[PDB]
Design a protein around this nucleic acid. Structure first.
Ligand SMILES: [Mg+2]
Ligand SMILES: [Mg+2]
Ligand SMILES: [Mg+2]
Ligand SMILES: [Mg+2]
Ligand SMILES: [Mg+2]
Ligand SMILES: [Mg+2]
Ligand SMILES: [Mg+2]
Ligand SMILES: [Mg+2]
Ligand SMILES: [Mg+2]
Ligand SMILES: [Mg+2]
Ligand SMILES: [Mg+2]
Ligand SMILES: [Mg+2]
Ligand SMILES: [Mg+2]
Ligand SMILES: [Mg+2]
Ligand SMILES: [Mg+2]
Ligand SMILES: [Mg+2]
Ligand SMILES: [Mg+2]
Ligand SMILES: [Mg+2]
Ligand SMILES: [Mg+2]
Ligand SMILES: [Mg+2]
Ligand SMILES: [Mg+2]
Ligand SMILES: [Mg+2]
Ligand SMILES: [Mg+2]
Ligand SMILES: [Mg+2]
Lengths: 201, 153, 402
RNA sequence: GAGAGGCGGCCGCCCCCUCGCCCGUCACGCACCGCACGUUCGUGGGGAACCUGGCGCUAAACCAUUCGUAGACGACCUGCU
RNA sequence: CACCCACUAAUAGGGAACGUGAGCUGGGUUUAGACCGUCGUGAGACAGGUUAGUUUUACCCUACUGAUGAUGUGUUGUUGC
RNA sequence: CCCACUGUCCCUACCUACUAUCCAGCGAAACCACAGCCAAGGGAACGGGCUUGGCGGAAUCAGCGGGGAAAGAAGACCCUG
RNA sequence: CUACGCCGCGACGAGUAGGAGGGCCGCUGCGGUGAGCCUUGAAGCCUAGGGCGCGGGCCCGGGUGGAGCCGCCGCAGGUGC
RNA sequence: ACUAAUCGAACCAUCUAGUAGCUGGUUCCCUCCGAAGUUUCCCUCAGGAUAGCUGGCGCUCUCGCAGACCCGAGCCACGCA
């Protein structure tokens, strides 16, 4: 779609979400993934930490400053996971990579926008309830990430402001439902039209 | 003689030429590129400053092993030199061009070096003596220089 | 195959960009962790390496051989004239690090401080902060400054103060002041902003930052040594005398595979002029500097309570290659990076000092002031004149001038 | 509203229309004679240049000289009514 | 390799073209001189012994070490992450 | 083997002359399929190119000796004729 | 209906070493032929010009050049990099 | 060892374009067909002859050819695998 697709990363499996995102940006769609620290990975935490520590070992013996770049922020981990699913060495894959933006937490450009969800990549439906999993935020923090604490406090502040906005939305919807009772005799002419065509049960 | 890049109008223009001039082609090519587009008064001062090592020419193409200098920062470059022989030869050609301008009756205080070009002249052969009874060339690299100056102010 | 005999590698890999430091001043790179329980205080200062000398002191370390004994110890004198606070920076913690929220300078920025903003002060028209200082007096600008202080009070986590040295009080050629950000620790952001705002344009001496016999950290740039070979840069073994191409080289710079030269191989390049920090440097003394109450008071600089000699920290004939120390100074223990008159950053120790070597009170018995411009053998001018008596130059001085 | 606020909201005064919203009456508009790239964001972004009113500003960088805390050369630290 | 002396916390074993000769050295091996023992009629031979016996080139690309610079925020500078 | 002697070494440092360095002038040669960052794979069983990944930022200066199974010679060792 | 011409129908189409056929592919020279071409511009060379052929190649436009050149039927090679 | 930078038989010219079962090279296009590294013999084993595999030139025959258009009017080719 021509708009920008903003996805909430909480509760999303890493490679399941990255596969969906990679195909989206290849089709000319701009994708933004927020709360990359909320992304989950299947398998217990120690198992997934061993996978990344093995990644830390892979470095150029001659000059590690040229070797693999190990990015410790959860946003950059997800970004690199998506990059492994793109043809990033061609101009088409580089253009697709530029359509994707990743954030830890939710920055102010996207914290006032409704956030989408990919059911095909959610842990609740893609993982058996008895299987263990790890958090990308915890995994990144225990391998070199320096901003787990500050993102935690900023996410708490964002959630406090969103609760206030939601209680204004509830107060608005309560007033609107009350209004539909107050103007009932002069609305039923248009309500009956809606009901016979499926809208407004 | 056939100049390349004949002037847009050969009435506000003057030409100067030199063949088989005994200066290094690589040095003179860089010096000519520096004074290209310059006003004739600016170029004469600049080429005098090259002799005094107060302004350098930027060695842009033939820069293999050319050292760095602080005066290359005036240009957008890092390597520069002060080729004295290339500057003096171009100063004589600027003087000859200016006297040609006076003969054509056009004033010399509005002249700009719109065209300048250094070509390779036929090489002159000399001889050097090497280690195990061997002979190698010691060739010289002269050059042809042509220029066209035009009035614009 | 394996090398025959084990040997540790030459040179630490923790300083591997062995290159000329991009800075001359030496940046802090880590301020002490801010805890709001302590009182509001500064964490850093700027000094200038004046020179070295040695002291005599009584050791109070029980169980040691030198307990209740006199020792001599090399010390470094660091002239520290008071800094002048000229601005405040706020920082906000983000998921990408600290970023500068807002910077507010003061009115009446000194000329020596303003030279820092100009590569060529001679041809400059001295226009820096001429319009900024005007908003400290008008109405809309002053209200805007209040908004900047309020927004710093509610959005910033750590604040710092821009402070500059008074280069005019030093005997150096340089007149351009050194600016530095000094983090304010120990209190709420509102409290440290109130403190830092009332120290604007004020002088902060080295007394208020550092105290007697505490361990601090010295951050600076070492002495430059130019391009150097592997035997001087990395202190590798010199090859035998029979070597053909030369013996001050590393014989093997790598095996056939990995078919490249590794970053861990010692190679020739720039030596010295590296940015370094050294921790746990004890302050044996904070000098008082020259004063005038009725006469010129010079005594307190190098007069210990056992010496009782009217003399200053200045050696006989002045510090070599530096000049005369006239302001306050900090007498660190041991050596310190940098040449003479090299600007040094002094920082509060990040660690917690609990060892007996730290928190040990220092009581100087004697401060050497012989000439360092040769084998000096007299402490003062008066002692030298008393020992040698009159000379020919003085004999004719009283003859020509009666 | 500071996490990348590049945004959003509320009042007071003034000038305008009782029109723009739904169901009806009433006719008209190039009705271009079957035909595509039509419709929008958008007064889009970027570069010069001309005219037009108001408010305003009058600086640095590099070279050359110097320093030697630096240095192979560049670079760097410096000084110059 | 081995063996012994001595210290030591310990004196573990290996790979990298049996790492590493435009890095060295040339003691050994492995040319031409020569001596001895054995074999061969002889020229001569001997994983038998012994002695003397030219170690050449980097200024290219990369790697690496340092040194200027370059792209972008209009120019430029300071402080910084 | 012993005495003496010493930078052969422990363990390296400093100094001097000439270079190298930068500049004015002058100015070659070797070598060159195209070229030149890596890990693994398979492959004439040790890739600069190929596959898969790591990635990749103009133009350069002084060094350097890991690579180019670097150059120098239609291997002199061994075998065949 | 150039009978060495024209037309129809069906199946088929890998290729080193190698063999064969066709070439209105190309070079040079000789015999015939084109009442051939050419100082109102030959050969040669250059060309972001127009094309033809599966291809070998060829024709034509423009420029330069300044005196020779080509097609067809045979003949003969010091005939294609 | 030395005998003109040449010595376990100098240099110069010729015989001489010495011989080589060995190494290197071997020049235009399209179309059609298309292998062998096996047998036997050889002072034969990096080569030949010989058979085999290949191509080219054919020749001897066989089924017939059909109804101008349209329309078949037990038995269905020599022989081969
Ligand atoms: Mg070079
Ligand atoms: Mg010579
Ligand atoms: Mg000779
Ligand atoms: Mg070991
Ligand atoms: Mg280590
Ligand atoms: Mg030697
Ligand atoms: Mg001394
Ligand atoms: Mg080896
Ligand atoms: Mg080697
Ligand atoms: Mg060697
Ligand atoms: Mg030997
Ligand atoms: Mg021998
Ligand atoms: Mg015998
Ligand atoms: Mg013996
Ligand atoms: Mg000898
Ligand atoms: Mg050089
Ligand atoms: Mg590789
Ligand atoms: Mg051979
Ligand atoms: Mg041979
Ligand atoms: Mg075929
Ligand atoms: Mg021929
Ligand atoms: Mg022959
Ligand atoms: Mg026989
Ligand atoms: Mg063969």
């Amino acid at each position: 779609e021509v708009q920008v697709l903003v996805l909430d990363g909480r509760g999303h499996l890493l490679g399941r979400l990255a596969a969906i995102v990679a195909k989206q940006v290849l089709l000319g769609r701009k994708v933004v993934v927020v709360r990359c620290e909320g992304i989950n990975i299947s398998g217990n935490f120690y198992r997934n930490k061993l996978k990344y520590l093995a990644f830390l070992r892979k470095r150029m013996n001659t000059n590690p400053s040229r070797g693999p770049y190990h990015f410790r922020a959860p946003s950059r981990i997800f970004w690199r996971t998506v990059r492994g699913m793109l043809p990033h060495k061609t101009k088409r894959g580089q253009a697709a990579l530029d359509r994707l933006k990743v954030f830890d937490g939710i920055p102010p450009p996207y914290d006032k926008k409704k956030r989408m969800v990919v059911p095909a990549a959610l842990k609740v439906v893609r993982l058996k309830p008895t299987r263990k999993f790890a958090y990308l935020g915890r995994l990144a923090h225990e391998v070199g990430w320096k901003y787990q604490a500050v993102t935690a406090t900023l996410e708490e502040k964002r959630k406090e402001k969103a609760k206030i906005h939601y209680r204004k939305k509830k107060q608005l919807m309560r007033l609107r439902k009350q209004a539909e009772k107050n103007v009932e005799k002069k609305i039923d002419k248009y309500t009956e039209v809606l009901k016979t065509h499926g809208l407004l049960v | 003689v056939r100049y390349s890049l004949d002037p847009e109008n050969p009435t506000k223009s003057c030409k100067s030429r030199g063949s088989n001039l005994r200066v290094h082609f690589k040095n003179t090519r860089e010096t000519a590129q520096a004074i290209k587009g310059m006003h004739i008064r600016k170029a004469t001062k600049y080429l005098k400053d090259v002799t005094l090592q107060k302004q350098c020419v930027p060695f842009r193409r033939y820069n293999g092993g050319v050292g760095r200098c602080a005066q290359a920062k005036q240009w957008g470059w890092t390597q520069g030199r002060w080729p004295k022989k290339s500057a003096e030869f171009l100063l004589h050609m600027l003087k000859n061009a200016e006297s040609n301008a006076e003969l054509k009756g056009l004033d010399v205080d509005s002249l700009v070096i719109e065209h300048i070009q250094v070509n390779k002249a036929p090489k002159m052969r000399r001889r050097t003596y090497r280690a195990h009874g061997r002979i190698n060339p010691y060739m010289s690299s002269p050059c042809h220089i042509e220029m066209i100056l035009t009035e614009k102010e | 195959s394996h090398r025959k005999f084990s040997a540790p590698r030459h040179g630490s890999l923790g300083f591997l960009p062995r290159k000329r430091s991009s800075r001359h001043r030496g940046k802090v790179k880590s301020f002490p962790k801010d805890d709001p329980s302590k009182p509001v205080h500064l964490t850093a200062f700027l000094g200038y390496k004046a020179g070295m000398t040695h002291i005599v002191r009584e050791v109070d370390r029980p169980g040691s051989k030198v307990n209740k004994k006199e020792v001599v110890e090399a010390v470094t004198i660091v002239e520290t004239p008071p800094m002048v606070v000229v601005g405040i920076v706020g920082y906000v913690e983000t998921p990408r690090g600290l970023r500068t929220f807002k910077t507010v300078f003061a009115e009446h920025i000194s000329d020596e401080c303003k030279r820092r903003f100009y590569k060529n002060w001679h041809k400059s028209k001295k226009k820096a902060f001429t319009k900024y200082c005007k908003k400290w007096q008008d109405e809309d600008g002053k209200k805007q400054l209040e908004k900047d202080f309020s927004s710093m009070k509610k959005y910033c986590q750590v604040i710092r103060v821009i402070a500059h040295t008074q280069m005019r009080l030093l005997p150096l050629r340089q007149k351009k002041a050194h600016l530095m950000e000094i983090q304010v620790n120990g209190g709420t952001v509102a409290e440290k902003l109130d403190w830092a705002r009332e120290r604007l344009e004020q002088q902060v001496p080295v007394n208020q930052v550092f105290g007697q016999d505490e361990m601090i950290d010295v951050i600076g740039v070492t002495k430059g040594k130019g391009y150097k070979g592997v035997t001087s840069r990395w202190h590798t073994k010199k090859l035998p005398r029979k070597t053909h191409r030369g013996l001050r080289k590393v014989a093997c710079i790598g095996a056939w595979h990995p078919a490249r030269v590794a970053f861990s191989v010692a190679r020739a390049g720039q030596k010295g002029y590296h940015h370094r920090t050294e921790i746990n440097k004890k302050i044996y003394k904070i000098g008082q500097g020259y004063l005038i109450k009725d006469g010129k008071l010079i005594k307190n600089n190098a007069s210990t309570d056992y010496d009782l000699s009217d003399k200053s920290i200045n050696p006989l004939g002045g510090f070599v290659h530096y000049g005369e120390v006239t302001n306050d100074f900090v007498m660190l223990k041991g050596c310190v990076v940098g040449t003479k008159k090299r600007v040094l950053t002094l920082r509060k120790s990040l660690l917690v000092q609990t060892k007996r070597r730290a928190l040990e009170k220092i009581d100087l018995k004697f401060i050497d002031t012989t000439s360092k411009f040769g084998h000096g053998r007299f402490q003062t001018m008066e002692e030298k004149k008393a020992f040698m008596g009159p000379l020919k130059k003085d004999r004719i001085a009283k003859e020509e001038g009666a």
